[PDB]
Amino acid sequence: VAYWRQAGLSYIRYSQICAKAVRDALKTEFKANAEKTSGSNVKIV
């Protein structure tokens, strides 16, 4: 029982945050391309 699960999160959120952290710490050479390949366009209705 990790701390964030005690806070009410979900591993999907954990994974999003971690992937975003690795994408931001990416060099500007690869940063735009990597961010493109993981951008979210879906919209809830």
Contact 38, 23 (CB under 8 A): yes
* Positive or negative torsion for Cα 38, 18, 5, 2: positive
Smaller CB separation from other proteins, 39 or 45: 39
Q: Which is nearer to other proteins, 29 or 45 (CB)?
A: 29
- Does the protein bind other proteins through residue 32 (CB under 8 A)? no
Closest CA to 27 of 16, 37, 15, 35: 35
Query: Which residues would be at the binding site for other proteins (CB under 8 A)?
Result: 2-4, 6-9, 11, 13-15, 17-19, 21-27, 29-30, 34, 37-38
